[PDB]
């Protein structure tokens, strides 16, 4: 019956992870407005003919 | 076109048709560009390839 309130009153709990990943983040969208051009050096120079 | 049919007035009248024509003469066109050969030779990038 009688017991310190720092052992039983502390350990009478059940940890659950329902709250984990409850919310999300905005989906990727840069694909719809940009192309992917891989690079192999410090910079990329572009040139086109008129 | 043939003349319109009309009521005979007492003596039939000879009419005539109207034919015409239209002529068009050919025209000659040109478009050209000049480039130094060294630029093409020094074209490792390939800028002048789509010419």
């Amino acid at each position: 019956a009688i017991i310190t309130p720092a052992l039983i009153s502390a350990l009478k709990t059940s940890f659950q992870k329902h709250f984990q990943d409850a919310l999300a983040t905005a989906p990727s969208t840069y694909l719809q407005v940009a192309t992917v051009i891989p690079s192999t050096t410090a910079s990329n120079t572009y040139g086109w003919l008129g | 076109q043939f003349p319109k049919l009309r009521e005979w007035i007492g003596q039939r009248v000879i009419k005539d048709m109207a034919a015409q024509g239209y002529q068009i003469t050919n025209k000659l066109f040109e478009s050209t560009v000049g480039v130094k050969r060294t630029d093409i030779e020094d074209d490792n990038l390939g800028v002048y390839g789509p010419l």
Side-chain angles (χ1 to χ4, degrees), chain A residues 39-45:
Chain A
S39 178
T40 68
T41 191
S43 71
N44 279 351
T45 302

Side-chain angles (χ1 to χ4, degrees), chain B residues 1-50:
Chain B
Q1 275 178 19
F2 204 71
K4 257 188 196 175
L5 275 71
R6 65 185 182 80
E7 183 178 1
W8 165 78
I9 56 166
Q11 186 187 356
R12 302 173 77 176
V13 180
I14 301 299
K15 300 188 186 286
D16 63 358
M17 291 184 185
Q20 57 252 37
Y22 182 56
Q23 187 182 256
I24 313 156
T25 303
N26 297 303
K27 283 212 189 154
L28 179 53
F29 301 87
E30 65 84 30
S31 60
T32 187
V33 302
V35 59
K36 189 180 286 294
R37 77 182 281 169
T38 50
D39 305 354
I40 294 284
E41 296 174 305
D42 309 331
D43 192 24
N44 303 352
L45 264 57
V47 178
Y48 315 135

